[PDB]
Amino acid sequence: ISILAKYQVQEERYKLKSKKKLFGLSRSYSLKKYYETVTKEVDIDFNLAAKYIPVVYGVQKIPGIPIFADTELHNPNIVYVVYAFAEGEIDGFLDFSFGDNPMICV
Amino acid sequence: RDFKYTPTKNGELSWLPSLTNNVVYYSIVHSGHAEPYIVQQLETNPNERMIQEIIGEPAGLAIFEIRAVDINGRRSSPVTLSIELNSAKNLSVVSNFRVTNTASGDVTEFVGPDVKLAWDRIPEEDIIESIFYTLEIHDPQNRMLRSVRIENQYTYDYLLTYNKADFALQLYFRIRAEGDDGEQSVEWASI
Amino acid sequence: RDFKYTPTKNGELSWLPSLTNNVVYYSIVHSGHAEPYIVQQLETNPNERMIQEIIGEPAGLAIFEIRAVDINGRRSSPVTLSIELNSAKNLSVVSNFRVTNTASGDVTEFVGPDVKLAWDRIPEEDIIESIFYTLEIHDPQNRMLRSVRIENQYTYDYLLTYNKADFALQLYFRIRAEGDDGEQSVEWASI
Amino acid sequence: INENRTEIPEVSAEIQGKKVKVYHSDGRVTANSTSLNGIWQTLDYLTSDRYGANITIDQFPLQQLIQEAAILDIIDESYQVSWQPYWRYVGWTNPLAENRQIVQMN
């Protein structure tokens, strides 16, 4: 990750998107405190919980956990990155979003 | 990376691009100039040198400082170079090399017994001292009639005495600007 | 929007501005050129075409790719165009059209019985082949004396035979560069 | 990396999840695919030992659980499938075969 930061704008250099944004509401919560704790983003700096692998059933959208980054020696413009996503044998990947832009047209 | 002056126009600076891909342009500060050079990074390739030319400086000590500018406007640490610049070797060709003892209309044979020549001063004398003009005079056989050095002067007189002596030991003329350090007009002017 | 080549100088590209108002400039990549064109958006209006000229290319296949640059440096998806470029129709006027059989001082009547003409090659022959020179010769009556095509050659000889024949069937001269595809000098040169 | 992609974007993806051991009353164990059913989801999460509760399967009455799934997969008719274009991303593998059940979970 400390390598990967050298290839990102200061907006992002350590940020990550959260997982399972809408946890279940119950009468235990105040409406306000619920929606104010619903949070889109996390910083991996000083946060370890982000690096736990999620489990998925059905269809969902999830962020990639980076675990390796490097460049081809002769041509630093060529960058390999490994993203881990999900526990177990999944039925398979459907689509990728780079930023919010999906490959397939909406 | 690898900021490097290189001699031959006084020479070229060259460098390899910064690996920070958001780099938009390089700036160069030159000792004694009022303002930096600006060099765009219109293409990105990590192994391809960028270049800036240095032209019209006198030989002398100079320093250069070069900085990358990020799209957010902040800059790298500088790289510095300090070097002696040297004269442009390839001088201008002499201009308006012309004969003044010339008739109404135009000459083939000149007027009178001996030619009087003028030429117009080159630019480079404004910058580099000890320039001179070298002049050579030849017969239709292209033998040497006479060879002359003129020191920071723009006229010369051939003489009937000279013609007689050169004949007795025995027209076309060519002239060039010249100096030390290999300083020469790229070509002869001639008549 | 509406990226469009348009023929006549080989032609103009034109487009309507991107609706993303933070656009600072457009870049254009042209097949076989070393570097893109850059076109500033110094004024914003959504219905007003921007233009880039294409000049000095030979007729031939080319492709163009055009991209908007946002102030943050990212770019739109490209738009692509592929087309055959064609010759600049409006060629240079011939230069230094001049008579070589000419006296000391200057002529009115030329020297000797028949004229010898020269002219200097145009630029466009460097790019477009099958250019030729068209030459026309006229009396004070402005009747046809003679009309001639010269193929990639820069001199021509009039003759006392020609004058005699043209008189017997019975000065001023005009010449232009010319080609197919409507390729012509914008005007006659003349003497 | 080039002049038109000056930085790496964020990466996130859409996936079809873990395979789960759906049972059948005839004694088969198809174990082939995701299931949208909440029971088989719970059973996999509980009986997983790499993660989850590490409960041994012999403590569960399969002939009961299958009846529960036979409840939860009741067909609804308050709507019709043609009102749902997204269906492939929604999780349905075919828009025409009934995709409607009181409960579907992602």
Side-chain angles (χ1 to χ4, degrees), chain C residues 72-84:
Chain C
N72 299 272
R74 76 174 294 151
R75 291 97 189 283
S76 67
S77 308
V79 174
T80 299
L81 183 64
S82 177
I83 52 170
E84 177 173 44

PDB file of all heavy atoms in Angstrom, chain C residues 72-84:
ATOM      1  N   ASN C  72      -8.542  19.296 -14.011  1.00  0.00           N
ATOM      2  CA  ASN C  72      -7.858  18.333 -13.158  1.00  0.00           C
ATOM      3  C   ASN C  72      -6.916  17.426 -13.931  1.00  0.00           C
ATOM      4  O   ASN C  72      -6.209  16.623 -13.316  1.00  0.00           O
ATOM      5  CB  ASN C  72      -8.875  17.491 -12.396  1.00  0.00           C
ATOM      6  CG  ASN C  72      -9.760  18.325 -11.506  1.00  0.00           C
ATOM      7  OD1 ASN C  72      -9.428  18.595 -10.353  1.00  0.00           O
ATOM      8  ND2 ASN C  72     -10.892  18.749 -12.041  1.00  0.00           N
ATOM      9  N   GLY C  73      -6.894  17.533 -15.251  1.00  0.00           N
ATOM     10  CA  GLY C  73      -5.969  16.809 -16.080  1.00  0.00           C
ATOM     11  C   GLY C  73      -6.506  15.534 -16.692  1.00  0.00           C
ATOM     12  O   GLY C  73      -5.912  15.033 -17.652  1.00  0.00           O
ATOM     13  N   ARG C  74      -7.608  14.997 -16.181  1.00  0.00           N
ATOM     14  CA  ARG C  74      -8.183  13.832 -16.826  1.00  0.00           C
ATOM     15  C   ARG C  74      -8.856  14.229 -18.133  1.00  0.00           C
ATOM     16  O   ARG C  74      -9.091  15.406 -18.412  1.00  0.00           O
ATOM     17  CB  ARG C  74      -9.174  13.141 -15.902  1.00  0.00           C
ATOM     18  CG  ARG C  74     -10.494  13.836 -15.781  1.00  0.00           C
ATOM     19  CD  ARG C  74     -11.432  12.995 -14.958  1.00  0.00           C
ATOM     20  NE  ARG C  74     -11.752  11.750 -15.643  1.00  0.00           N
ATOM     21  CZ  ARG C  74     -12.068  10.618 -15.031  1.00  0.00           C
ATOM     22  NH1 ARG C  74     -12.168  10.548 -13.715  1.00  0.00           N
ATOM     23  NH2 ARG C  74     -12.293   9.529 -15.759  1.00  0.00           N
ATOM     24  N   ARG C  75      -9.168  13.224 -18.941  1.00  0.00           N
ATOM     25  CA  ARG C  75      -9.675  13.449 -20.281  1.00  0.00           C
ATOM     26  C   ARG C  75     -10.943  12.660 -20.556  1.00  0.00           C
ATOM     27  O   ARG C  75     -11.189  11.607 -19.964  1.00  0.00           O
ATOM     28  CB  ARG C  75      -8.620  13.091 -21.299  1.00  0.00           C
ATOM     29  CG  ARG C  75      -7.470  14.056 -21.268  1.00  0.00           C
ATOM     30  CD  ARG C  75      -6.326  13.545 -20.454  1.00  0.00           C
ATOM     31  NE  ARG C  75      -5.341  14.600 -20.289  1.00  0.00           N
ATOM     32  CZ  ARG C  75      -4.493  14.973 -21.233  1.00  0.00           C
ATOM     33  NH1 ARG C  75      -4.384  14.302 -22.365  1.00  0.00           N
ATOM     34  NH2 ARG C  75      -3.720  16.031 -21.028  1.00  0.00           N
ATOM     35  N   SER C  76     -11.734  13.189 -21.482  1.00  0.00           N
ATOM     36  CA  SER C  76     -12.873  12.481 -22.026  1.00  0.00           C
ATOM     37  C   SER C  76     -12.420  11.204 -22.725  1.00  0.00           C
ATOM     38  O   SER C  76     -11.237  10.991 -22.990  1.00  0.00           O
ATOM     39  CB  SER C  76     -13.627  13.368 -23.006  1.00  0.00           C
ATOM     40  OG  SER C  76     -12.829  13.609 -24.147  1.00  0.00           O
ATOM     41  N   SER C  77     -13.389  10.351 -23.030  1.00  0.00           N
ATOM     42  CA  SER C  77     -13.213   9.391 -24.103  1.00  0.00           C
ATOM     43  C   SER C  77     -12.864  10.096 -25.410  1.00  0.00           C
ATOM     44  O   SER C  77     -13.336  11.203 -25.675  1.00  0.00           O
ATOM     45  CB  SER C  77     -14.479   8.571 -24.299  1.00  0.00           C
ATOM     46  OG  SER C  77     -14.913   8.004 -23.083  1.00  0.00           O
ATOM     47  N   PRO C  78     -12.039   9.474 -26.242  1.00  0.00           N
ATOM     48  CA  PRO C  78     -11.706  10.069 -27.533  1.00  0.00           C
ATOM     49  C   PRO C  78     -12.863  10.011 -28.510  1.00  0.00           C
ATOM     50  O   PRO C  78     -13.737   9.145 -28.430  1.00  0.00           O
ATOM     51  CB  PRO C  78     -10.539   9.212 -28.022  1.00  0.00           C
ATOM     52  CG  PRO C  78     -10.775   7.913 -27.410  1.00  0.00           C
ATOM     53  CD  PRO C  78     -11.377   8.180 -26.066  1.00  0.00           C
ATOM     54  N   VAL C  79     -12.855  10.951 -29.445  1.00  0.00           N
ATOM     55  CA  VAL C  79     -13.570  10.838 -30.707  1.00  0.00           C
ATOM     56  C   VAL C  79     -12.564  10.650 -31.829  1.00  0.00           C
ATOM     57  O   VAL C  79     -11.499  11.279 -31.832  1.00  0.00           O
ATOM     58  CB  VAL C  79     -14.458  12.059 -30.974  1.00  0.00           C
ATOM     59  CG1 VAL C  79     -15.062  11.955 -32.342  1.00  0.00           C
ATOM     60  CG2 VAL C  79     -15.530  12.125 -29.942  1.00  0.00           C
ATOM     61  N   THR C  80     -12.899   9.784 -32.776  1.00  0.00           N
ATOM     62  CA  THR C  80     -12.002   9.423 -33.858  1.00  0.00           C
ATOM     63  C   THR C  80     -12.608   9.798 -35.200  1.00  0.00           C
ATOM     64  O   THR C  80     -13.825   9.740 -35.393  1.00  0.00           O
ATOM     65  CB  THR C  80     -11.712   7.935 -33.850  1.00  0.00           C
ATOM     66  OG1 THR C  80     -11.079   7.583 -32.616  1.00  0.00           O
ATOM     67  CG2 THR C  80     -10.822   7.570 -35.008  1.00  0.00           C
ATOM     68  N   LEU C  81     -11.738  10.188 -36.126  1.00  0.00           N
ATOM     69  CA  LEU C  81     -12.126  10.443 -37.501  1.00  0.00           C
ATOM     70  C   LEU C  81     -11.059   9.876 -38.426  1.00  0.00           C
ATOM     71  O   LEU C  81      -9.865   9.971 -38.130  1.00  0.00           O
ATOM     72  CB  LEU C  81     -12.317  11.938 -37.735  1.00  0.00           C
ATOM     73  CG  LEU C  81     -12.797  12.344 -39.117  1.00  0.00           C
ATOM     74  CD1 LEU C  81     -14.174  11.776 -39.324  1.00  0.00           C
ATOM     75  CD2 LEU C  81     -12.817  13.852 -39.240  1.00  0.00           C
ATOM     76  N   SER C  82     -11.487   9.283 -39.542  1.00  0.00           N
ATOM     77  CA  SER C  82     -10.575   8.765 -40.556  1.00  0.00           C
ATOM     78  C   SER C  82     -11.021   9.186 -41.948  1.00  0.00           C
ATOM     79  O   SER C  82     -12.180   8.976 -42.318  1.00  0.00           O
ATOM     80  CB  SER C  82     -10.489   7.243 -40.477  1.00  0.00           C
ATOM     81  OG  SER C  82      -9.650   6.735 -41.497  1.00  0.00           O
ATOM     82  N   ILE C  83     -10.106   9.777 -42.719  1.00  0.00           N
ATOM     83  CA  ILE C  83     -10.468  10.492 -43.938  1.00  0.00           C
ATOM     84  C   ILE C  83      -9.269  10.517 -44.872  1.00  0.00           C
ATOM     85  O   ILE C  83      -8.127  10.332 -44.449  1.00  0.00           O
ATOM     86  CB  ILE C  83     -10.935  11.929 -43.615  1.00  0.00           C
ATOM     87  CG1 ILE C  83      -9.889  12.617 -42.747  1.00  0.00           C
ATOM     88  CG2 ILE C  83     -12.252  11.890 -42.907  1.00  0.00           C
ATOM     89  CD1 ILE C  83     -10.131  14.087 -42.562  1.00  0.00           C
ATOM     90  N   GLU C  84      -9.532  10.757 -46.156  1.00  0.00           N
ATOM     91  CA  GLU C  84      -8.499  11.135 -47.112  1.00  0.00           C
ATOM     92  C   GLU C  84      -8.373  12.652 -47.197  1.00  0.00           C
ATOM     93  O   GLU C  84      -9.320  13.340 -47.591  1.00  0.00           O
ATOM     94  CB  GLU C  84      -8.800  10.562 -48.492  1.00  0.00           C
ATOM     95  CG  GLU C  84      -7.788  10.994 -49.539  1.00  0.00           C
ATOM     96  CD  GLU C  84      -7.985  10.302 -50.871  1.00  0.00           C
ATOM     97  OE1 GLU C  84      -9.145  10.199 -51.323  1.00  0.00           O
ATOM     98  OE2 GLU C  84      -6.980   9.867 -51.469  1.00  0.00           O
TER      99      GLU C  84
END
